[PDB]
Amino acid sequence: RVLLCSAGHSSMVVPEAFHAVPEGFEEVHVFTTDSEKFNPVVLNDFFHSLPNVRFSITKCHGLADILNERDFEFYQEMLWQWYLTKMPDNELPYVCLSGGIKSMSASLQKAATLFGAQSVFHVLADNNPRNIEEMFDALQKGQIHFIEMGYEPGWAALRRLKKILPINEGCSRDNFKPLISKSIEEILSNVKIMASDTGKSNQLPFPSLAILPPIAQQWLQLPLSANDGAWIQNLPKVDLHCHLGGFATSGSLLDQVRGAASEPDLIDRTFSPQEIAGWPRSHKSISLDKYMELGNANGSKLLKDKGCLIRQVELLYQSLVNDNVAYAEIRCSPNNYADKNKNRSAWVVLQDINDTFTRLITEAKQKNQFYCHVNLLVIASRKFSGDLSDISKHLALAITAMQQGEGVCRIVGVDLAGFENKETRASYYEHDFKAVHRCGLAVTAHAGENDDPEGIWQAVYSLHARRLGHALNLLEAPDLMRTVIERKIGVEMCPYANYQIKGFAPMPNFSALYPLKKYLEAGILVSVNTDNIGISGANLSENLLILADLCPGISRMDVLTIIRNSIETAFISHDFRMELLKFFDRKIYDVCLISIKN
Amino acid sequence: RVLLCSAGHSSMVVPEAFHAVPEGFEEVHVFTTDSEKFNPVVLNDFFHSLPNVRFSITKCHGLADILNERDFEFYQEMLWQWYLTKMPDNELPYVCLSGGIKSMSASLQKAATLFGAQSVFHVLADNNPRNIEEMFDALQKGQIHFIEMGYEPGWAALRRLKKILPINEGCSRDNFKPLISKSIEEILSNVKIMASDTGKSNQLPFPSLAILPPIAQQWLQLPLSANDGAWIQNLPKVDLHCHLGGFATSGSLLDQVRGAASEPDLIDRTFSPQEIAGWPRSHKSISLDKYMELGNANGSKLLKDKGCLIRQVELLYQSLVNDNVAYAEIRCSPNNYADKNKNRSAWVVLQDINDTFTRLITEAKQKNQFYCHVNLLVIASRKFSGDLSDISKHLALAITAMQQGEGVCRIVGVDLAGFENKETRASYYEHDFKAVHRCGLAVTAHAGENDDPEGIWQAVYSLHARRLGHALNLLEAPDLMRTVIERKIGVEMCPYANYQIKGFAPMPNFSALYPLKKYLEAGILVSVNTDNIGISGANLSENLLILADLCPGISRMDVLTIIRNSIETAFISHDFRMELLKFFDRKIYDVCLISIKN
Ligand SMILES: Nc1ncnc2c1ncn2[C@@H]1O[C@H](COP(=O)(O)OP(=O)(O)OP(=O)(O)O)[C@@H](O)[C@H]1O
Ligand SMILES: [Mg+2]
Ligand SMILES: [Mg+2]
């Protein structure tokens, strides 16, 4: 534990403060003015007699004493900076103020009641000793009193400034930056709002956003622009549509993933994807057959090798972490990644993926970096070319994948993905799903891509699906939005992928307007995703960035509420959801405040 | 404008403090200990030169100096009490902090931070003035210096703490009661309670709850007690399960209704209740049966006519408004009140109810009062043996009612209540609801009070229900418990009804405990309701009050979360939900900042 104090003429207050806790203090630091009256020799001797306790002195350099308003405000600002930079990262610190004249004592007490303190107290000696040999017996005689006027909690989030303002070392009065002004204006202009409006208080998610100063709060409501990309890079994000096999399809990713293949003889390195003019900003709509022929370079031909798959998983995890993503669900198809000649069953492949992800999560968590949680989603394919029984296999595997349970990464549910050419919607597979919901899994459904808005109703009701894929043409069925919104049914959508494959504004000759803003206005639980991280040629950061051009007039509150919806619609447990929400709220406050100070 | 300060050995601080604002002042008060060093002559002579203002001196009897813990606590108690009784009625005062030694400085700074002050400031003069002429010259020279720490909004609930104890007519050490120290120890006990608590600390209900002072939040963390009735009485609330047919059934509440009978003859006036002793605190648990006979004073027998029904609905709306319920839904079964001979069809009854509700709402809205928006629920009671075809009729009625659309009040869904049994589960009526879901209706299911778990599973998966009634036995089937949590299927539970039916808050010979605390901890979107108002003999406010003795260890923040859940699972459109959220956040912030003083 740590304590803070200020000393003036009374140079022996610090040893009395150290004796406050019978257990014994661990860190002692004192902030004092430039006055020569304070004697560092006695304190240095006392703290060298107890080397086990860390010791550090900071001094208000350039100000011997306070005599005008400027001296007081400079000293108070330096004191607040010192308190901010010297408080413990997690626990609140202890405070003593028995030394110093009324000015510094009051300033540090207001600091304690502003920044929070573990325990604030005073020491008073009846015999007012001067050297150690006197208060030794004074505390032995009991004349020394350790008074406590009460614990002070302080604001729940007002030490977070320790990150937004690079606690700078200090500065001559000419190089003056008023942190005092920032704290005062934030407190005032967020309290000088009364109970009138205060409407945007609830209209915003992440309830700590209200505490954010209005100097940036009104900046949040301004329409989004393509120049704010740096900011959204620092935003913690959530991805729900990221195919595992859709990562290494272009760039040096291909070279690195093929270099990790155990046998380079079988891999056909000659095949290369065809480039599209202006990619990812294509000048025309790209057909779906063109979509997975562009993605035909990746798939299952090269990931059959165990080492190649391991390297792909590690590279995808590294790309996820480097993009400030905090949570992700990865769609995988183990059946495609299995073979019997080398005796690699699909269950073995899924177990290997799970082990790789949990090992990466644990190794990232041990060293306390920013790591992204990953959960898996087994693909129950449309199963082209007959042999329908395969799908049932997948479902069974899914159940037996969930019952393993133990680990940090888990199989949260199944998927219903495939071509819309066969017109098969819900009823063509409904004969099997009377057991997945019984187990306790979750069912998504990529439907409504280019077909009628009818089968989506069966997907919502007959399948009890909790999320929907794409479905950009929901505007033609208001009776469908009624049940979509009323049921709190989430919707996943990937602006880059669907924009490339179908075409939207502002691309000329395409008059269809992108409905994401309309969906948000209607209240649909919308979640922006990446679909195929590699083939689409754009990660989640640019995928969210492009909305400033795809849907003009979109605001930053919209981006934050999409993030909130993506958090809400994830297939996660309750306690994990709250933990994720708390971490996301703290980090979102941090970034949204650091951004405006630049 | 008032000046609040403490003077010890120094008496020259007060003239400078008065001369702080060039505009002058009107009132000055000074507190002091029993120290004989303090001389009052100088201040009296100075203030007599300005008779237009009022001056006073406060002396701490029997305390000359602070030498130990008892002296410190005594001085703190009397200074806090004196500062509280000198509080101006509606305006924050100005505080001076350059008198005495640092102890009173820190104590009164803490007092100013807690109770609030217009502006706290310190004086300082180089010459250290002693008498009148020389300090007047010092003020003329401009050598006087004034430093204002900042305007403190203050915590606005310790104000009419004056109203209970303004002054204990000169309290002595033999009769001193440090009530302010009791409040401080209350907050300290809250701190040592919540210092190792997770879960709840996550996500306040609505935002703008964080802008409250930290003391307010710390108070909010305190577990709720039976003494906090007035706070929730002022608190806006929401009802979702209220029976119209059981509002007035005892006391004088049915007298004015029956009194307003259209045909004052066929109205029986001889029925009596079952002479229940402990109602609504009845320790003896009675199991159904006696309920319907107890409520026979109202219902079908009395609601056949028109005037009585209008009087009953007006009285119910008045009671709803009186309890600060900002939104509620009422269960009703119009086919039970229809009279074919008098041309009063079921549709006629429903139209009359809707029209009177919307007229009352419009009348309340015209006067800019606290109008309670009310929506309707039609009950498809499981009459079973008697002409089950009527069931379909009821559903048809609903589909034909909400279609009319226009009006503030509407029929938003159906209720599947009735004789819950092995047969009467969701397994025979599910053929008919194909229509209901196609018309944007919401379906509840009163089940689980005596039914098996698989019946609840069918209800939540076959009828696509969105809320459940009672359902007190969810802890015995963790699988359906989880499928309730992660599907966001709300649970309506009535505390008083289940208390009088089953056994919790142990009466003699019963040890079963209410699971509401476990329900909330697990993350279910639980919602406290009333079922019936009359027969239960308790409105919503007492229903929430009884929770303190029903589920000990529940905190008021969880009560706010319960309100949020209630306003989350209500069947309403998104925009109306947002507006309702705004109004609720406003009223709750105002309540917790103003009326929480008790
Ligand atoms: N569910 C989570 N998801 C991602 N990261 C988490 C999660 N839980 C904890 N962490 C990590 O715990 C660490 C705690 O950090 P800490 O409280 O010390 O704040 P900080 O060091 O000032 O800034 P930062 O949050 O960036 O580390 C965070 O870095 C965070 O990445
Ligand atoms: Mg996809
Ligand atoms: Mg009922």
GROMACS .gro file of N, CA, C and O in nm, chain A residues 12-96:
model
  340
   12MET      N    1   0.885   1.594   1.120
   12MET     CA    2   0.872   1.461   1.179
   12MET      C    3   0.733   1.401   1.163
   12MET      O    4   0.705   1.295   1.220
   13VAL      N    5   0.645   1.465   1.085
   13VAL     CA    6   0.510   1.412   1.066
   13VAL      C    7   0.513   1.280   0.991
   13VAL      O    8   0.430   1.191   1.015
   14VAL      N    9   0.606   1.265   0.896
   14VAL     CA   10   0.609   1.145   0.813
   14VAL      C   11   0.634   1.018   0.895
   14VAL      O   12   0.566   0.918   0.871
   15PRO      N   13   0.730   1.015   0.989
   15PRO     CA   14   0.742   0.894   1.073
   15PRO      C   15   0.616   0.861   1.151
   15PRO      O   16   0.584   0.743   1.167
   16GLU      N   17   0.544   0.963   1.199
   16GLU     CA   18   0.417   0.936   1.266
   16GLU      C   19   0.315   0.878   1.170
   16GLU      O   20   0.238   0.788   1.206
   17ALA      N   21   0.312   0.929   1.046
   17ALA     CA   22   0.219   0.878   0.946
   17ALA      C   23   0.250   0.732   0.913
   17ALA      O   24   0.158   0.652   0.892
   18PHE      N   25   0.379   0.697   0.906
   18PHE     CA   26   0.416   0.559   0.877
   18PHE      C   27   0.370   0.462   0.985
   18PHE      O   28   0.348   0.344   0.956
   19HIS      N   29   0.352   0.510   1.108
   19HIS     CA   30   0.308   0.425   1.219
   19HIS      C   31   0.157   0.415   1.230
   19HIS      O   32   0.108   0.355   1.326
   20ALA      N   33   0.082   0.472   1.135
   20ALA     CA   34  -0.063   0.473   1.145
   20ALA      C   35  -0.120   0.331   1.144
   20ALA      O   36  -0.208   0.298   1.225
   21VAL      N   37  -0.073   0.247   1.054
   21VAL     CA   38  -0.121   0.110   1.041
   21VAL      C   39  -0.029   0.019   1.122
   21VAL      O   40   0.093   0.021   1.099
   22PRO      N   41  -0.081  -0.058   1.217
   22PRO     CA   42   0.005  -0.151   1.291
   22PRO      C   43   0.070  -0.255   1.201
   22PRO      O   44   0.180  -0.303   1.232
   23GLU      N   45   0.005  -0.292   1.091
   23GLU     CA   46   0.064  -0.387   0.997
   23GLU      C   47   0.192  -0.330   0.935
   23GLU      O   48   0.291  -0.402   0.920
   24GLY      N   49   0.191  -0.202   0.899
   24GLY     CA   50   0.309  -0.139   0.843
   24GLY      C   51   0.291  -0.094   0.700
   24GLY      O   52   0.250  -0.173   0.614
   25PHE      N   53   0.321   0.032   0.672
   25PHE     CA   54   0.308   0.085   0.538
   25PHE      C   55   0.415   0.027   0.446
   25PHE      O   56   0.519  -0.022   0.490
   26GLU      N   57   0.388   0.033   0.316
   26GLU     CA   58   0.477  -0.023   0.215
   26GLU      C   59   0.541   0.081   0.125
   26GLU      O   60   0.656   0.065   0.085
   27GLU      N   61   0.469   0.188   0.092
   27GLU     CA   62   0.523   0.297   0.011
   27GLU      C   63   0.485   0.430   0.074
   27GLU      O   64   0.368   0.452   0.107
   28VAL      N   65   0.583   0.517   0.092
   28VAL     CA   66   0.563   0.649   0.151
   28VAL      C   67   0.621   0.754   0.057
   28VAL      O   68   0.737   0.745   0.017
   29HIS      N   69   0.539   0.854   0.022
   29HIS     CA   70   0.583   0.964  -0.062
   29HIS      C   71   0.524   1.094  -0.009
   29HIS      O   72   0.412   1.096   0.043
   30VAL      N   73   0.601   1.202  -0.024
   30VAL     CA   74   0.563   1.332   0.029
   30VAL      C   75   0.587   1.437  -0.079
   30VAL      O   76   0.693   1.439  -0.142
   31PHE      N   77   0.489   1.525  -0.099
   31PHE     CA   78   0.501   1.640  -0.188
   31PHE      C   79   0.512   1.765  -0.102
   31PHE      O   80   0.424   1.793  -0.020
   32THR      N   81   0.621   1.840  -0.120
   32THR     CA   82   0.645   1.961  -0.043
   32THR      C   83   0.692   2.071  -0.136
   32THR      O   84   0.737   2.046  -0.249
   33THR      N   85   0.682   2.195  -0.089
   33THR     CA   86   0.721   2.310  -0.168
   33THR      C   87   0.873   2.321  -0.173
   33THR      O   88   0.947   2.236  -0.122
   34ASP      N   89   0.921   2.429  -0.236
   34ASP     CA   90   1.064   2.454  -0.250
   34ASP      C   91   1.127   2.511  -0.123
   34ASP      O   92   1.248   2.534  -0.122
   35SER      N   93   1.047   2.537  -0.020
   35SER     CA   94   1.099   2.600   0.102
   35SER      C   95   1.212   2.517   0.162
   35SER      O   96   1.200   2.395   0.176
   36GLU      N   97   1.321   2.585   0.199
   36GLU     CA   98   1.436   2.518   0.258
   36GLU      C   99   1.409   2.470   0.400
   36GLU      O  100   1.491   2.394   0.454
   37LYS      N  101   1.298   2.512   0.462
   37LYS     CA  102   1.271   2.474   0.600
   37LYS      C  103   1.254   2.324   0.614
   37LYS      O  104   1.301   2.264   0.712
   38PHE      N  105   1.186   2.261   0.518
   38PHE     CA  106   1.171   2.116   0.520
   38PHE      C  107   1.307   2.048   0.518
   38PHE      O  108   1.393   2.081   0.435
   39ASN      N  109   1.327   1.954   0.609
   39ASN     CA  110   1.457   1.889   0.627
   39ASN      C  111   1.452   1.748   0.570
   39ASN      O  112   1.388   1.660   0.630
   40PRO      N  113   1.517   1.721   0.457
   40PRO     CA  114   1.515   1.584   0.403
   40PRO      C  115   1.606   1.488   0.477
   40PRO      O  116   1.593   1.366   0.457
   41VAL      N  117   1.698   1.538   0.561
   41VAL     CA  118   1.797   1.451   0.622
   41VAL      C  119   1.732   1.353   0.720
   41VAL      O  120   1.761   1.233   0.719
   42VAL      N  121   1.644   1.404   0.806
   42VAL     CA  122   1.581   1.318   0.907
   42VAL      C  123   1.495   1.212   0.841
   42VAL      O  124   1.499   1.094   0.879
   43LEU      N  125   1.415   1.252   0.742
   43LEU     CA  126   1.331   1.156   0.671
   43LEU      C  127   1.415   1.053   0.597
   43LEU      O  128   1.382   0.934   0.596
   44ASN      N  129   1.524   1.097   0.535
   44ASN     CA  130   1.612   1.004   0.464
   44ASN      C  131   1.673   0.903   0.560
   44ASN      O  132   1.679   0.784   0.529
   45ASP      N  133   1.718   0.948   0.677
   45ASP     CA  134   1.772   0.855   0.776
   45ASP      C  135   1.665   0.757   0.824
   45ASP      O  136   1.691   0.637   0.836
   46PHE      N  137   1.545   0.807   0.851
   46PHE     CA  138   1.438   0.720   0.900
   46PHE      C  139   1.402   0.614   0.797
   46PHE      O  140   1.378   0.498   0.832
   47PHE      N  141   1.396   0.652   0.669
   47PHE     CA  142   1.358   0.558   0.565
   47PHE      C  143   1.473   0.468   0.521
   47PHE      O  144   1.448   0.360   0.466
   48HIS      N  145   1.598   0.509   0.544
   48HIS     CA  146   1.710   0.418   0.525
   48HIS      C  147   1.718   0.317   0.639
   48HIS      O  148   1.767   0.205   0.619
   49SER      N  149   1.673   0.355   0.759
   49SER     CA  150   1.661   0.259   0.867
   49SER      C  151   1.558   0.151   0.838
   49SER      O  152   1.562   0.044   0.900
   50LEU      N  153   1.466   0.176   0.744
   50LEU     CA  154   1.367   0.078   0.700
   50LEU      C  155   1.371   0.071   0.548
   50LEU      O  156   1.281   0.121   0.479
   51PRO      N  157   1.475   0.008   0.492
   51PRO     CA  158   1.487   0.003   0.345
   51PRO      C  159   1.377  -0.078   0.277
   51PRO      O  160   1.358  -0.063   0.156
   52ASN      N  161   1.304  -0.162   0.351
   52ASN     CA  162   1.198  -0.242   0.293
   52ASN      C  163   1.081  -0.159   0.243
   52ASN      O  164   0.997  -0.211   0.169
   53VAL      N  165   1.072  -0.032   0.281
   53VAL     CA  166   0.963   0.056   0.241
   53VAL      C  167   1.016   0.153   0.136
   53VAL      O  168   1.114   0.224   0.160
   54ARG      N  169   0.952   0.154   0.020
   54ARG     CA  170   0.994   0.243  -0.088
   54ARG      C  171   0.968   0.389  -0.049
   54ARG      O  172   0.877   0.419   0.029
   55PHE      N  173   1.050   0.478  -0.104
   55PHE     CA  174   1.050   0.618  -0.063
   55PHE      C  175   1.077   0.706  -0.184
   55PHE      O  176   1.165   0.675  -0.265
   56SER      N  177   1.002   0.816  -0.197
   56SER     CA  178   1.017   0.906  -0.310
   56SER      C  179   0.966   1.044  -0.273
   56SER      O  180   0.856   1.058  -0.220
   57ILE      N  181   1.046   1.146  -0.305
   57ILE     CA  182   1.015   1.286  -0.277
   57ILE      C  183   1.000   1.360  -0.409
   57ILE      O  184   1.085   1.348  -0.498
   58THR      N  185   0.891   1.435  -0.421
   58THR     CA  186   0.872   1.531  -0.529
   58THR      C  187   0.858   1.669  -0.467
   58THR      O  188   0.803   1.684  -0.357
   59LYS      N  189   0.910   1.770  -0.536
   59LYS     CA  190   0.910   1.906  -0.484
   59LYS      C  191   0.854   2.001  -0.589
   59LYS      O  192   0.878   1.984  -0.709
   60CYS      N  193   0.779   2.102  -0.542
   60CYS     CA  194   0.723   2.203  -0.630
   60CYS      C  195   0.835   2.299  -0.670
   60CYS      O  196   0.854   2.406  -0.613
   61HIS      N  197   0.911   2.257  -0.771
   61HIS     CA  198   1.029   2.332  -0.813
   61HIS      C  199   0.988   2.465  -0.876
   61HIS      O  200   0.900   2.470  -0.962
   62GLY      N  201   1.053   2.572  -0.832
   62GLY     CA  202   1.026   2.705  -0.881
   62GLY      C  203   0.933   2.788  -0.794
   62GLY      O  204   0.919   2.909  -0.818
   63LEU      N  205   0.871   2.728  -0.693
   63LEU     CA  206   0.779   2.798  -0.603
   63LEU      C  207   0.820   2.770  -0.459
   63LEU      O  208   0.788   2.665  -0.404
   64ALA      N  209   0.892   2.865  -0.399
   64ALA     CA  210   0.932   2.850  -0.259
   64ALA      C  211   0.811   2.851  -0.166
   64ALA      O  212   0.803   2.770  -0.074
   65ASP      N  213   0.717   2.942  -0.190
   65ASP     CA  214   0.597   2.951  -0.107
   65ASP      C  215   0.487   3.017  -0.188
   65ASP      O  216   0.512   3.080  -0.291
   66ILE      N  217   0.364   3.000  -0.141
   66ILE     CA  218   0.246   3.056  -0.207
   66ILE      C  219   0.217   3.193  -0.149
   66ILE      O  220   0.202   3.208  -0.027
   67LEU      N  221   0.208   3.294  -0.236
   67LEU     CA  222   0.176   3.429  -0.193
   67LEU      C  223   0.070   3.497  -0.279
   67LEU      O  224   0.019   3.602  -0.237
   68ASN      N  225   0.036   3.443  -0.396
   68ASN     CA  226  -0.069   3.499  -0.480
   68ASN      C  227  -0.150   3.384  -0.539
   68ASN      O  228  -0.125   3.266  -0.512
   69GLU      N  229  -0.250   3.420  -0.620
   69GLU     CA  230  -0.339   3.319  -0.677
   69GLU      C  231  -0.267   3.229  -0.776
   69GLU      O  232  -0.293   3.108  -0.782
   70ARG      N  233  -0.176   3.285  -0.856
   70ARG     CA  234  -0.105   3.205  -0.955
   70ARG      C  235  -0.018   3.099  -0.889
   70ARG      O  236  -0.013   2.984  -0.935
   71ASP      N  237   0.050   3.135  -0.780
   71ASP     CA  238   0.129   3.037  -0.706
   71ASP      C  239   0.040   2.924  -0.656
   71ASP      O  240   0.075   2.806  -0.668
   72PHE      N  241  -0.076   2.958  -0.599
   72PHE     CA  242  -0.164   2.855  -0.545
   72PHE      C  243  -0.214   2.763  -0.655
   72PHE      O  244  -0.217   2.641  -0.638
   73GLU      N  245  -0.256   2.819  -0.769
   73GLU     CA  246  -0.311   2.735  -0.875
   73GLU      C  247  -0.203   2.647  -0.937
   73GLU      O  248  -0.228   2.530  -0.967
   74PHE      N  249  -0.082   2.701  -0.956
   74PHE     CA  250   0.027   2.618  -1.006
   74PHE      C  251   0.060   2.505  -0.909
   74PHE      O  252   0.079   2.390  -0.951
   75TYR      N  253   0.066   2.536  -0.779
   75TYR     CA  254   0.096   2.433  -0.681
   75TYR      C  255  -0.013   2.327  -0.678
   75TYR      O  256   0.015   2.208  -0.667
   76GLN      N  257  -0.140   2.370  -0.686
   76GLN     CA  258  -0.250   2.275  -0.684
   76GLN      C  259  -0.248   2.185  -0.807
   76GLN      O  260  -0.273   2.065  -0.797
   77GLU      N  261  -0.217   2.242  -0.924
   77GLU     CA  262  -0.208   2.161  -1.045
   77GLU      C  263  -0.094   2.060  -1.035
   77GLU      O  264  -0.111   1.943  -1.071
   78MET      N  265   0.023   2.103  -0.986
   78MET     CA  266   0.134   2.010  -0.971
   78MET      C  267   0.101   1.902  -0.868
   78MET      O  268   0.137   1.786  -0.885
   79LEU      N  269   0.032   1.940  -0.760
   79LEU     CA  270  -0.008   1.844  -0.659
   79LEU      C  271  -0.105   1.741  -0.716
   79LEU      O  272  -0.095   1.622  -0.685
   80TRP      N  273  -0.200   1.786  -0.797
   80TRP     CA  274  -0.294   1.692  -0.857
   80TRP      C  275  -0.223   1.600  -0.955
   80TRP      O  276  -0.253   1.480  -0.960
   81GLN      N  277  -0.128   1.653  -1.033
   81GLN     CA  278  -0.050   1.568  -1.122
   81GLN      C  279   0.028   1.463  -1.043
   81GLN      O  280   0.033   1.346  -1.082
   82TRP      N  281   0.090   1.504  -0.933
   82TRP     CA  282   0.168   1.411  -0.851
   82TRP      C  283   0.079   1.305  -0.788
   82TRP      O  284   0.115   1.186  -0.787
   83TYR      N  285  -0.037   1.345  -0.735
   83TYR     CA  286  -0.131   1.248  -0.678
   83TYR      C  287  -0.180   1.151  -0.785
   83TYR      O  288  -0.194   1.031  -0.759
   84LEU      N  289  -0.207   1.202  -0.905
   84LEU     CA  290  -0.253   1.117  -1.014
   84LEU      C  291  -0.147   1.017  -1.056
   84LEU      O  292  -0.178   0.900  -1.083
   85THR      N  293  -0.021   1.060  -1.063
   85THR     CA  294   0.085   0.972  -1.109
   85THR      C  295   0.140   0.881  -1.000
   85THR      O  296   0.212   0.786  -1.031
   86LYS      N  297   0.107   0.907  -0.873
   86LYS     CA  298   0.163   0.829  -0.763
   86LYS      C  299   0.059   0.743  -0.692
   86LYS      O  300   0.096   0.667  -0.602
   87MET      N  301  -0.067   0.752  -0.730
   87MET     CA  302  -0.166   0.663  -0.671
   87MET      C  303  -0.150   0.521  -0.727
   87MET      O  304  -0.103   0.504  -0.840
   88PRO      N  305  -0.185   0.419  -0.650
   88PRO     CA  306  -0.174   0.282  -0.701
   88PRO      C  307  -0.269   0.258  -0.817
   88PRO      O  308  -0.374   0.321  -0.828
   89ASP      N  309  -0.229   0.165  -0.905
   89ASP     CA  310  -0.306   0.141  -1.027
   89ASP      C  311  -0.446   0.089  -0.996
   89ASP      O  312  -0.543   0.130  -1.060
   90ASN      N  313  -0.458  -0.001  -0.899
   90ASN     CA  314  -0.586  -0.063  -0.867
   90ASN      C  315  -0.648  -0.010  -0.739
   90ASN      O  316  -0.762   0.035  -0.739
   91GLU      N  317  -0.574  -0.015  -0.628
   91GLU     CA  318  -0.627   0.022  -0.498
   91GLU      C  319  -0.609   0.171  -0.472
   91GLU      O  320  -0.519   0.235  -0.527
   92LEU      N  321  -0.697   0.226  -0.389
   92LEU     CA  322  -0.685   0.366  -0.350
   92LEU      C  323  -0.570   0.383  -0.251
   92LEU      O  324  -0.533   0.289  -0.180
   93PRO      N  325  -0.510   0.502  -0.245
   93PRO     CA  326  -0.399   0.526  -0.152
   93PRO      C  327  -0.446   0.587  -0.021
   93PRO      O  328  -0.559   0.632  -0.006
   94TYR      N  329  -0.353   0.589   0.075
   94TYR     CA  330  -0.373   0.654   0.204
   94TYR      C  331  -0.326   0.799   0.197
   94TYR      O  332  -0.238   0.833   0.118
   95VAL      N  333  -0.384   0.883   0.282
   95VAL     CA  334  -0.355   1.026   0.280
   95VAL      C  335  -0.338   1.077   0.423
   95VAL      O  336  -0.417   1.042   0.512
   96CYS      N  337  -0.235   1.159   0.444
   96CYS     CA  338  -0.217   1.235   0.567
   96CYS      C  339  -0.186   1.379   0.531
   96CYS      O  340  -0.119   1.406   0.431
   0.00000   0.00000   0.00000
